[PDB]
Coordinates of C-alpha atoms in Angstrom, one line a residue:
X1 CA 0.4 0.0 0.2
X2 CA 0.7 3.6 0.0
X3 CA 2.5 5.6 2.9
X4 CA 1.4 7.7 5.6
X5 CA 3.1 10.7 4.4
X6 CA 2.5 13.3 2.1
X7 CA 5.0 14.7 -0.3
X8 CA 5.2 18.7 -1.2
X9 CA 3.8 19.8 -4.9
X10 CA 3.3 22.1 -7.5
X11 CA -0.5 22.7 -5.3
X12 CA 1.1 23.8 -1.6
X13 CA 0.4 27.3 -1.2
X14 CA 2.1 29.2 1.2
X15 CA -0.1 30.7 3.7
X16 CA 0.4 34.3 4.1
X17 CA -1.4 34.2 0.4
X18 CA -4.9 33.7 2.6
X19 CA -7.3 34.8 4.5
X20 CA -10.0 33.1 6.9
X21 CA -12.7 35.3 6.5
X22 CA -15.8 33.4 8.9
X23 CA -16.4 29.8 9.9
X24 CA -19.3 27.3 8.0
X25 CA -19.6 24.6 10.1
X26 CA -17.2 22.0 11.0
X27 CA -16.9 19.3 9.2
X28 CA -15.1 15.7 8.9
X29 CA -11.5 16.7 9.6
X30 CA -12.5 19.4 11.4
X31 CA -14.1 23.6 11.6
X32 CA -14.3 24.3 7.5
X33 CA -14.0 28.6 6.4
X34 CA -14.5 31.3 4.2
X35 CA -11.7 33.5 3.8
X36 CA -9.4 35.0 -0.2
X37 CA -6.9 33.3 -1.5
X38 CA -4.2 35.4 -3.7
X39 CA -2.5 32.8 -6.6
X40 CA -5.4 30.4 -6.5
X41 CA -6.8 31.3 -9.8
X42 CA -5.1 32.0 -13.4
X43 CA -4.5 35.7 -14.3
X44 CA -7.2 36.2 -11.4
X45 CA -6.5 38.5 -8.6
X46 CA -7.7 37.3 -5.2
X47 CA -10.4 34.5 -5.2
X48 CA -13.4 33.8 -3.1
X49 CA -12.6 30.1 -1.3
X50 CA -14.0 27.8 1.1
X51 CA -10.4 26.5 3.5
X52 CA -11.1 22.7 5.4
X53 CA -9.0 22.9 7.7
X54 CA -8.2 19.3 11.1
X55 CA -8.1 19.8 13.9
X56 CA -4.8 20.0 16.3
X57 CA -6.8 16.8 18.1
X58 CA -5.9 15.1 15.1
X59 CA -3.6 12.3 15.1
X60 CA -0.9 12.8 12.5
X61 CA -2.3 9.6 10.5
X62 CA -5.9 11.2 10.0
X63 CA -4.0 14.7 9.4
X64 CA -2.6 12.1 6.6
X65 CA -5.6 10.7 5.2
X66 CA -6.3 14.3 4.6
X67 CA -4.0 15.9 2.5
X68 CA -4.2 12.2 0.5
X69 CA -8.6 12.7 -0.2
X70 CA -7.6 15.8 -1.5
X71 CA -4.6 14.7 -3.3
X72 CA -7.7 12.6 -5.8
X73 CA -8.5 15.4 -6.6
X74 CA -5.6 17.2 -7.5
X75 CA -6.9 15.2 -11.2
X76 CA -10.0 16.2 -10.9
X77 CA -10.6 19.4 -13.6
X78 CA -14.5 19.9 -14.1
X79 CA -17.2 22.1 -14.8
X80 CA -19.1 20.7 -12.3
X81 CA -17.5 19.4 -9.5
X82 CA -15.9 22.0 -6.4
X83 CA -12.7 21.9 -7.3
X84 CA -8.7 22.1 -5.4
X85 CA -7.0 25.3 -5.5
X86 CA -4.9 24.5 -3.3
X87 CA -2.8 22.7 -0.5
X88 CA -1.2 24.2 2.7
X89 CA 0.9 20.5 3.8
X90 CA 3.9 22.9 6.2
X91 CA 2.7 23.7 9.3
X92 CA -0.8 24.4 11.4
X93 CA -3.6 23.6 11.1
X94 CA -3.7 22.0 7.8
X95 CA -5.3 23.5 5.1
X96 CA -7.5 23.2 1.8
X97 CA -7.9 25.5 -0.1
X98 CA -11.6 24.7 -1.8
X99 CA -14.2 26.9 -4.6
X100 CA -16.3 28.4 -2.5
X101 CA -20.1 27.5 -2.6
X102 CA -21.9 30.0 -1.8
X103 CA -25.2 28.2 -1.6
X104 CA -24.6 25.3 0.6
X105 CA -25.6 21.9 -0.3
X106 CA -29.0 20.9 -2.2
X107 CA -30.9 19.6 0.1
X108 CA -30.3 22.1 2.6
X109 CA -31.3 24.4 -0.6
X110 CA -34.0 23.0 -1.0
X111 CA -35.9 22.7 2.0
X112 CA -35.1 26.6 2.4
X113 CA -37.6 26.4 -0.9
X114 CA -40.5 24.7 1.2
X115 CA -40.9 27.7 3.9
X116 CA -46.7 33.9 -6.2
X117 CA -43.4 32.9 -5.3
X118 CA -43.4 28.9 -6.4
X119 CA -41.6 26.2 -6.9
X120 CA -38.5 25.5 -8.9
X121 CA -39.3 24.3 -12.5
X122 CA -38.9 21.8 -14.5
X123 CA -36.6 23.7 -16.4
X124 CA -34.5 24.1 -13.7
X125 CA -34.8 20.7 -12.4
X126 CA -33.4 19.4 -16.0
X127 CA -30.9 21.7 -15.7
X128 CA -29.6 20.6 -12.2
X129 CA -30.2 17.2 -13.4
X130 CA -27.6 17.9 -16.3
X131 CA -25.5 19.9 -14.7
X132 CA -25.5 16.9 -11.6
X133 CA -25.6 13.9 -14.5
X134 CA -22.3 16.1 -15.9
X135 CA -19.4 15.7 -12.4
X136 CA -20.6 12.3 -11.7
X137 CA -20.6 10.8 -15.9
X138 CA -16.7 12.8 -16.0
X139 CA -15.9 11.5 -12.4
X140 CA -17.4 8.1 -13.5
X141 CA -15.1 8.1 -17.0
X142 CA -12.1 8.8 -15.1
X143 CA -12.6 6.2 -13.5
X144 CA -13.8 6.7 -10.5
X145 CA -17.9 6.1 -8.2
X146 CA -19.6 8.3 -5.4
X147 CA -20.2 5.5 -3.0
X148 CA -22.5 8.3 -1.4
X149 CA -24.0 10.5 -3.9
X150 CA -27.1 12.7 -2.4
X151 CA -28.6 16.2 -2.3
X152 CA -26.5 16.6 0.2
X153 CA -23.2 16.0 -1.2
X154 CA -24.1 18.7 -4.2
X155 CA -23.2 21.9 -4.2
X156 CA -25.6 24.8 -5.4
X157 CA -22.7 28.0 -6.7
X158 CA -22.8 31.7 -6.1
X159 CA -25.3 31.4 -9.3
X160 CA -27.1 28.9 -8.9
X161 CA -25.2 25.7 -10.8
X162 CA -24.8 22.4 -9.3
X163 CA -21.6 20.8 -8.6
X164 CA -20.5 17.7 -7.7
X165 CA -19.4 18.4 -4.1
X166 CA -16.2 17.8 -2.1
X167 CA -15.3 15.0 0.1
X168 CA -16.1 15.5 4.0
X169 CA -18.9 18.0 3.1
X170 CA -21.2 16.7 4.0
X171 CA -23.4 18.7 7.2
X172 CA -24.1 16.7 10.8
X173 CA -27.0 18.4 10.6
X174 CA -28.3 15.0 8.1
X175 CA -26.5 11.9 10.8
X176 CA -30.1 11.0 9.9
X177 CA -29.6 10.1 7.0
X178 CA -27.1 7.0 7.8
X179 CA -27.5 3.7 9.5
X180 CA -25.5 0.8 10.6
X181 CA -27.4 -1.9 8.6
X182 CA -26.2 -5.1 10.0
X183 CA -25.4 -3.4 13.1
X184 CA -21.6 -2.9 11.3
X185 CA -20.7 0.7 9.5
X186 CA -23.5 3.8 9.3
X187 CA -24.2 3.1 5.8
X188 CA -26.4 6.2 2.6
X189 CA -29.5 3.1 3.7
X190 CA -31.8 5.8 2.1
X191 CA -29.8 6.4 -1.8
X192 CA -27.9 2.7 -2.1
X193 CA -29.0 0.4 -5.1
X194 CA -31.0 -3.1 -4.3
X195 CA -27.6 -5.1 -5.7
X196 CA -25.2 -2.3 -3.2
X197 CA -27.5 -3.8 -0.3
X198 CA -27.4 -7.5 -1.0
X199 CA -23.6 -7.5 -2.2
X200 CA -22.3 -4.4 -0.7
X201 CA -20.8 -3.4 -4.1
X202 CA -20.7 -0.2 -5.3
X203 CA -20.3 1.2 -9.2
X204 CA -20.9 2.6 -12.2
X205 CA -24.5 1.9 -11.6
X206 CA -25.0 2.1 -8.0
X207 CA -24.6 6.1 -8.6
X208 CA -27.2 6.2 -11.2
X209 CA -29.0 4.1 -8.8
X210 CA -28.5 7.4 -6.4
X211 CA -28.6 9.7 -9.4
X212 CA -32.1 8.7 -9.1
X213 CA -33.8 9.2 -6.1
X214 CA -32.2 12.3 -5.7
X215 CA -33.7 13.5 -8.7
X216 CA -36.3 12.5 -6.5
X217 CA -35.1 15.1 -3.7
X218 CA -35.1 17.4 -5.6
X219 CA -37.9 17.3 -7.1
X220 CA -39.8 16.8 -3.6
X221 CA -38.0 20.0 -2.5
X222 CA -36.1 17.0 -0.7
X223 CA -38.2 14.8 1.1
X224 CA -36.7 11.9 2.8
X225 CA -37.2 8.7 1.0
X226 CA -39.2 5.7 2.1
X227 CA -39.9 8.5 4.6
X228 CA -42.8 6.2 5.8
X229 CA -40.8 2.8 6.1
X230 CA -37.6 3.2 9.0
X231 CA -34.0 2.1 7.8
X232 CA -34.9 -1.7 8.3
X233 CA -37.7 -1.9 6.4
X234 CA -36.2 0.0 3.7
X235 CA -33.3 -3.4 2.5
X236 CA -36.3 -4.8 2.5
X237 CA -38.8 -2.6 0.4
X238 CA -35.5 -2.1 -2.1
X239 CA -34.4 -5.4 -2.1
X240 CA -37.0 -7.1 -3.2
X241 CA -38.1 -4.4 -5.5
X242 CA -40.0 -1.6 -4.1
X243 CA -39.3 1.4 -5.9
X244 CA -40.7 5.4 -4.8
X245 CA -44.1 6.8 -5.4
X246 CA -43.8 9.6 -8.8
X247 CA -44.2 12.7 -6.0
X248 CA -47.7 14.7 -5.9
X249 CA -46.5 17.0 -9.5
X250 CA -43.5 15.5 -9.9
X251 CA -42.8 16.7 -14.2
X252 CA -43.6 12.8 -16.5
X253 CA -40.4 13.2 -17.3
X254 CA -38.2 13.7 -14.6
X255 CA -40.0 10.5 -13.0
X256 CA -39.4 8.8 -16.2
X257 CA -36.0 9.4 -15.9
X258 CA -36.1 7.7 -12.3
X259 CA -37.7 4.7 -12.8
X260 CA -34.9 4.0 -16.4
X261 CA -32.5 5.1 -12.6
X262 CA -33.9 2.2 -11.1
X263 CA -33.4 -0.6 -13.0
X264 CA -33.6 -3.4 -11.0
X265 CA -30.5 -4.9 -13.1
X266 CA -27.7 -2.6 -12.5
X267 CA -26.6 -3.1 -17.0
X268 CA -30.4 -1.4 -17.7
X269 CA -30.3 1.4 -16.0
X270 CA -28.7 4.4 -18.3
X271 CA -25.3 5.6 -17.7
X272 CA -25.2 9.3 -16.6
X273 CA -24.2 10.0 -20.6
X274 CA -27.2 8.6 -21.7
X275 CA -28.9 10.2 -19.3
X276 CA -27.8 13.8 -20.9
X277 CA -28.6 12.4 -24.0
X278 CA -32.1 12.8 -23.1
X279 CA -32.1 15.9 -21.7
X280 CA -29.6 17.6 -23.7
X281 CA -32.3 19.9 -25.9
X282 CA -33.6 20.7 -22.6
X283 CA -29.7 22.5 -21.0
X284 CA -28.6 25.8 -21.3
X285 CA -26.5 26.8 -24.0
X286 CA -23.9 27.3 -22.2
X287 CA -23.9 24.2 -20.4
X288 CA -22.5 23.0 -24.0
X289 CA -19.7 24.9 -23.7
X290 CA -18.3 24.1 -19.8
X291 CA -19.6 20.6 -19.9
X292 CA -17.8 17.1 -19.7
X293 CA -20.5 16.1 -22.0
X294 CA -19.2 18.5 -25.2
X295 CA -15.6 18.5 -23.8
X296 CA -12.5 17.5 -25.7
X297 CA -12.3 14.8 -22.7
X298 CA -15.3 12.9 -23.5
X299 CA -14.5 9.8 -26.2

């Protein structure tokens, strides 16, 4: 296996080029912040950024697995995936400078719409659907599965664009979205595919499955899936072929999309590129300019 060390490369940023403006809420490894960082964007003066830290009471090991996780993202460069701008390995605390997403996670954003004004339009939904499908399609292309795709792990950018959220950001308040299946590890059973539940495997296919539960979230303004059913009852229901009900006033198209995402046989569900294909005529023109879908890279 790989060692528990971190070799500083060209992502290393001089701490003196950073400033903390305020807290945003504790995260997996510690307090996350909002601030500014010089020399992070090319030809750009300053940049508003998110700064993830690691508690002082953390093991060098946890601290090492923090930079390792952030490094996986050193490879990504997709408009619909919250980007890593830099790293600060030298000193204390250990930082990770990310792209700032002023509007937070999609689940919070969505539920905040519950409380003249009308709910999200199909056009706006297709937008989020396509934008999310784009990030996942990009990641899967790079041979990467999410294992935890959900509204809570999607970010809403300043201009409302949705991107695949980076690691260690899930809000502590959604703790309920997890369950210790078989008294073992914490799993997001309400977003998991029938096969992942039964065989413990996660593939590109189980991501499309989750994608579908997310399309559901977007439409039900983020209702807990299988609300009536308890965690243990969900495992039976889903594994036996039970689906989620078409939410009220849910456009035919979206539930139609959902239905396909939930084909019991994983190979029968569409891949992320196909999902985009069936909804590309609904996507805004800019998507043509920033998406991985129309990008060179798609081969």
